[PDB]
Amino acid sequence: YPDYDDFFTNTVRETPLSSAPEPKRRFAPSKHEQKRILQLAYAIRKGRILTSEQRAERERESQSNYADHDLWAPPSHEESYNPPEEYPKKYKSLRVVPAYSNLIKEKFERCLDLYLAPR
Amino acid sequence: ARKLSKALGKGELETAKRLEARKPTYSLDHIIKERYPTFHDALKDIDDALSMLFLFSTMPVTDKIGAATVANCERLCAEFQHYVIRSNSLRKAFLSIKGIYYQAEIFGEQITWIVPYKFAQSVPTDVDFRIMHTFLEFYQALMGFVNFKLYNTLGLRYPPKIDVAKSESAAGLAAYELEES
Amino acid sequence: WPEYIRLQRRRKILNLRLKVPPAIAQFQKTLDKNTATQVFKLLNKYRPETAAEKKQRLVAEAEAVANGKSAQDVSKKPYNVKYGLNHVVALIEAKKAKLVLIASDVDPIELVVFLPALCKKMGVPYAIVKNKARLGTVIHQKTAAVLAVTEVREEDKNELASIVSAVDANFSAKYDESRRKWGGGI
Amino acid sequence: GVLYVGRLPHGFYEKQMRMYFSQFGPVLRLRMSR
Amino acid sequence: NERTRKERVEQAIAKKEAQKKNRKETFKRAETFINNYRQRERERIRLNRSAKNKGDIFVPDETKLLFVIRIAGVKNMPPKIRKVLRLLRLSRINNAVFVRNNKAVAQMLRIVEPYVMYGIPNLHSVRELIYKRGFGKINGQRIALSDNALIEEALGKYDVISIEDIIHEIYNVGSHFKEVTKFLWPFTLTPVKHSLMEKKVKHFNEGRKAGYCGEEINELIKKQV
RNA sequence: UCAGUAACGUGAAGCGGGAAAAGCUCAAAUUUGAAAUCUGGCAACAUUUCUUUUGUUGUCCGAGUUGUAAUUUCAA
RNA sequence: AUUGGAUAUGCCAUAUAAAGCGCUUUCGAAGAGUCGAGUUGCAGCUCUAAAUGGGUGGUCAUCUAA
RNA sequence: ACAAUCUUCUCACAUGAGGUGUUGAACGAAAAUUUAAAUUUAGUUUGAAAUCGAUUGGUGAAAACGGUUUUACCACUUUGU
């Protein structure tokens, strides 16, 4: 188990290694794209590609889906603000009547009963 | 979501935008076909759905509830209010302690819908809004399908044209113009 | 234990209990947490264009040509990080790369075992970073093996001369004897 | 012990350093020369 | 099975407070403080630049009241900034309160504009905002105005008995507008994270903006509740 | 045919004479001014030994930088 | 009736492209437990290469395997 | 969030008036000021470089009990509308 004999890579080589000259296709527009553009450009004249504005506005008439075709080809107990049958509570004014906060828990319980409670 | 989190988790913001527009959405057409055969039977079971449509249309925006669906809850109930007013379908109305319970009759079936007062409501922190958002989606289709039927029955537009300027001024049923189709 | 897990912990430990040659020993000593969060911050400007939105700019390039306009006469030479193993070996031999990044988990380790020796010889400052997949996220790939900056614009040249100086001073200036001795056998 | 850390980003205060060095232990004295 | 549903909910209550109490004392990386000494230096420069030789305001006119919301905050803010935040009643970010537009208000509107966004309130939007987020400081407690009886009890001296009468004294801001806002605790417009991306972004709040949003402030209110 | 010949009872091959003759494809050099490559899913357009066959175009994943195309195979 | 390669002709094509050969003050990458030696019945076992190198034939000629 | 608000003119009038903002360190000139001290202050240099060298006038903002400690560009329009 000796150490690492870096006899060669000890120093630094200053030159590049491959000597073939720089090709001309690294100093100009990518001619593979220029061929690729002409395939898309031709496709517009034949009308197979919807263009960039057409990329935008044909998405906008969609996503409006609210029933665009026809599919078909206990009660109250006389309880109010001034109910005199019994003496809940009696409210003199409608503006003085508060908000019954139990309706949210009651309607959800009725909704959950049809799906979880048996019948 | 295990493609979006792959997109969001690798920093690619643009594919995170390109897939939420094509977020896959099921259709509520064939699930209302078989469970309610008759429109009159659908009229018979339109009370709880319209009541739920009138329920969440006045509260604030919740995380599990849909802010865009709140506009759907506002549009569907107004269309139910405009079409019933145009057909004079409302017969009985009581101003009970809970609110204004409207009893109407459209296409033969007498339907009663309870509507509460517009008060400063608060979150109950006990009703499963996840179960509510699912149940409201089941009620969102019936509100529109009936509007697809009632407006066709009354000759109006399904959905009717809504005046945003009158909606921004809070005109109610006057915003949703019941133009005859 | 399942049939494969008792291998999955043992090839973890046999890389530890055996004698790692100094060529492979440097592939576990790795660039730290801190200085491996700024390298990827500089690179996150020079990502290759996502193949979906390179086409997006190509339909916007090919629509004006179909009318008569153009942009090829005014198209400036692009920039990005340069990736792929065979393209980055030739970017070092030609002394074009300026920061080579080597993954620490290439499965056949011979794929990158000549790179810390080639970067030492050609004078290209190098660092071994974690998680080949972390490089893969940079260039919209599953697993990358190596990257390379060969040319940032004039905007980040002053940033790049500083961040390399963090790479030599932490990886190359340190880690100078653990690359020159055997590893493993813990 | 004492330390003289150089090449700090300009504007860094002893209030910034004592807020960070106290996470390493006790910070008895600090001097940001000016 | 409500008993098991409550017990599991009771078991859910204990785990929520445990992780909130265990996640504490996060270490501050060396990047955070140096930026804090810079962002505070930026705010100090922004204050003196807007104060010295800049004693004029824009004050978008044609509105007796304005909608100003602190969309964010400054960590270890300046003493003048925090006191102004205490003066503007926006002590916490994402708080909602409408204020009367004035030359002195515009000075405050230009004082915390780096940390708050201003605008103009819509007519029907405020009618729903009070109906949705009307929570007055009833006996010092931010209780909602669910009934007009309590509205008539507290604002009886201000001749306000109903929310519509309160809104009429707020839109057409009368002498009781200042007292009604004094009795009312500010609302809280926490941005709603709806889509799956809203819960993943790094410290994002559905992309709020800074400055005089104007009609966009009503649009922000449109998405607020 | 060489030839039952060289070589060691076994046993060729070169040359020559005929029949037929058509050449080539990768790996190894960076497309780096741009994975230009391909399978697959869906939808349109065709098309047929064929309603049974075989493709093109659009679109969305996916494969692929541990290398898919263009280029080159020493005759260069 | 199915089918062949053609001939003429009609419409399309996309060619900002591709190819032959001069001309080079430039470069020119070439396949390993294989070749090879030792050794048991072209295989087995032991060992294990190189770049004007390597192979097969008379210093030369001729070829370019894995 | 190592993201962030430093001025890609303004105002008047058509001529004005403004536009407050710049690493550190080393180096070194000869003059003017200002009130012995300060101010302006050539030319330099250099990696956002560094290894003791801190000067010390004035203004007040919060805790605290009229002292006291805390600001890390509080500067004379002088530290919390």
From Swiss-Prot, chain B:
It is found in: Nucleus, Nucleoplasm; Nucleus, Nucleolus. It comes from the Eukaryota. Belongs to the pescadillo family. Component of the NOP7 complex, composed of erb1/SPBC4F6.13c, ppp1/SPBC19F5.05c and ytm1/SPAC890.04c. Within the NOP7 complex erb1/SPBC4F6.13c appears to interact directly with ppp1/SPBC19F5.05c and ytm1/SPAC890.04c. The NOP7 complex also associates with the 66S pre-ribosome. Component of the NOP7 complex, which is required for maturation of the 25S and 5.8S ribosomal RNAs and formation of the 60S ribosome. This is Pescadillo homolog. The lineage of its organism: Eukaryota, Fungi, Dikarya, Ascomycota, Taphrinomycotina. The gene is ppp1.
Swiss-Prot record, chain C:
Keywords: Cytoplasm, Phosphoprotein, Ribonucleoprotein, Ribosomal protein. GO terms for biological process: cytoplasmic translation; maturation of LSU-rRNA. It is found in: Cytoplasm. GO terms for molecular function: RNA binding; structural constituent of ribosome. Component of the ribosome, a large ribonucleoprotein complex responsible for the synthesis of proteins in the cell. The small ribosomal subunit (SSU) binds messenger RNAs (mRNAs) and translates the encoded message by selecting cognate aminoacyl-transfer RNA (tRNA) molecules. The large subunit (LSU) contains the ribosomal catalytic site termed the peptidyl transferase center (PTC), which catalyzes the formation of peptide bonds, thereby polymerizing the amino acids delivered by tRNAs into a polypeptide chain. Component of the large ribosomal subunit (LSU). Mature yeast ribosomes consist of a small (40S) and a large (60S) subunit. The 40S small subunit contains 1 molecule of ribosomal RNA (18S rRNA) and at least 33 different proteins. The large 60S subunit contains 3 rRNA molecules (25S, 5.8S and 5S rRNA) and at least 46 different proteins. Belongs to the eukaryotic ribosomal protein eL8 family. This is Large ribosomal subunit protein eL8. The chain holds residues 52 to 237 of 259 of the full protein.
Curated annotation (Swiss-Prot), chain D:
It is found in: Nucleus, Nucleolus. It comes from the Eukaryota. This is Uncharacterized RNA-binding protein C1827.05c. The chain holds residues 105 to 138 of 276 of the full protein.
From Swiss-Prot, chain E:
It is found in: Cytoplasm; Nucleus, Nucleolus. GO terms for cellular component: cytosolic large ribosomal subunit; nucleolus; preribosome; preribosome, large subunit precursor. One of its GO terms (molecular function) is structural constituent of ribosome. InterPro entries: Ribo_uL30_ferredoxin-like_sf, Ribosomal_uL30, Ribosomal_uL30_CS, Ribosomal_uL30_euk, Ribosomal_uL30_euk_arc, Ribosomal_uL30_ferredoxin-like, Ribosomal_uL30_N_euk. Keywords: Cytoplasm, Nucleus, Ribonucleoprotein, Ribosomal protein. PROSITE patterns: RIBOSOMAL_L30 (PS00634). One of its GO terms (biological process) is assembly of large subunit precursor of preribosome. Pfam families: Ribosomal_L30, Ribosomal_L30_N. Its main location: cytoplasm. Coiled coil: none annotated. Gene3D superfamilies: Ribosomal protein L30, ferredoxin-like fold domain. Component of the small ribosomal subunit (SSU). Mature yeast ribosomes consist of a small (40S) and a large (60S) subunit. The 40S small subunit contains 1 molecule of ribosomal RNA (18S rRNA) and at least 33 different proteins. The large 60S subunit contains 3 rRNA molecules (25S, 5.8S and 5S rRNA) and at least 46 different proteins. There are 3 genes for uL30 in S.pombe. Belongs to the universal ribosomal protein uL30 family. This is Large ribosomal subunit protein uL30A. It comes from Schizosaccharomyces pombe (strain 972 / ATCC 24843) (Fission yeast). The gene is rlp7.
